[PDB]
């Protein structure tokens, strides 16, 4: 901080402030900015700062144990699964629910051009089409493994393709060429490692929150209710017209294979 000379620069003082801050809030989430820039963090911090707020510290961040030692639960060093802190983590303490926080943080991420030597967080692709750039070193794009040609006196990318896969490092040359193209693939913000609320520990697979899949299971589950409702004949309001026909359909049917005309 601004006090650059030796005076604290605290141990137990900030950890005590961090202590009351866990004890103050129902939900504590542990998150990664490391991908994110400085301003970019402030603006995500700004949204959270209205709702209820987040802190950084170092090993003084591991002291989820002292808060737990104060209360009775299981969000700490001891009872937890494997402490989900990773390097360059902060702690977000909140009034806000875990699912909602995940959506807040995960859903709205800020786009940010890739970096040389950074591992791609997701597949990076280039689109086909004219760059609009005149003839020059098109060769650099080919070196990168982007097929290119001059069409109509302009350098154009021949076809869409994945330049690099997820988990693979982005070469320097690649980054530089993607940047010239104006391509901004990566999404940065605070990644969620874990959330604690009310005696339970939630991991990022939980927090990315399915949600269409229940709309199909609800519609199917309602169709399971509805099905049961038409065929069963059990009529309070919905089920009731569908049943009447089941005695008639079965009869109307009974006319079709057959050999009365009446």
């Amino acid at each position: 901080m601004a006090i650059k000379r030796t005076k604290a620069e605290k141990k137990v003082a900030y950890d005590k402030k961090l202590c009351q801050l866990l004890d103050e809030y129902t939900k504590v989430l542990i998150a990664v900015a490391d991908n994110v820039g400085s301003n970019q963090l402030q603006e995500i911090r700004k949204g959270l700062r209205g709702d209820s707020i987040v802190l950084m510290g170092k090993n003084t961040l591991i002291r989820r144990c002292i808060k737990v030692h104060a209360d009775n639960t299981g969000n700490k060093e001891f009872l937890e699964l494997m402490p989900l802190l990773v390097g360059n983590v902060g702690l977000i303490f909140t009034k806000g629910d875990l699912k909602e926080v995940r959506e807040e943080v995960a859903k709205y991420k800020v786009g940010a051009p890739a970096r040389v030597g950074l591992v791609a967080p997701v597949d990076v692709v280039v689109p086909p089409g004219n760059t609009g750039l005149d003839p020059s070193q098109t060769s650099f794009f080919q070196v990168l493994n982007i097929p290119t040609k001059i069409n109509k006196g302009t350098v154009e990318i021949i076809t869409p393709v994945e330049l690099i896969k997820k988990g693979d490092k982005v070469g320097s040359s690649e980054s530089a060429l993607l940047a010239k193209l104006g391509i901004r693939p990566f999404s940065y913000g605070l990644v969620i490692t874990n959330v604690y609320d009310s005696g339970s520990v939630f991991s990022p697979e939980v927090l990315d929150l399915t949600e269409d899949d229940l709309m199909e299971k609800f519609a199917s589950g309602v169709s399971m209710v509805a099905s049961v409702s038409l065929a069963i004949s059990y009529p309070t309001i919905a089920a009731a017209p569908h049943m009447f026909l089941n005695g008639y359909k079965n009869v109307l049917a009974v006319a079709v294979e057959t050999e009365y005309s009446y």
Binding site: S233, Y234, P235, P241, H242, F244, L245, N246, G247, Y248
Partner: protein, 59 residues
């Protein structure tokens, strides 16, 4: 089912479907013991319904 065919059958004759007068009588003529609880939900569901209109969409 028993209940659906029995009140449908009474409906073709033009006879009403009441509890004791026709619905139990048709089911008792089958040799089966009826329910009062289904017979009252089938009768309660029937009230204020036009059976002829519902058949007319078929479904």
């Amino acid at each position: 089912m028993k209940f659906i065919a029995a009140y449908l059958l009474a409906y073709l004759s033009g006879n009403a479907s009441p509890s004791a007068e026709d619905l139990t009588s048709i089911l008792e003529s089958v040799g089966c013991e009826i329910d009062n609880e289904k017979m009252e939900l089938m009768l309660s569901q029937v009230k204020g319904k036009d059976i002829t209109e519902l058949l007319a969409a078929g479904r």
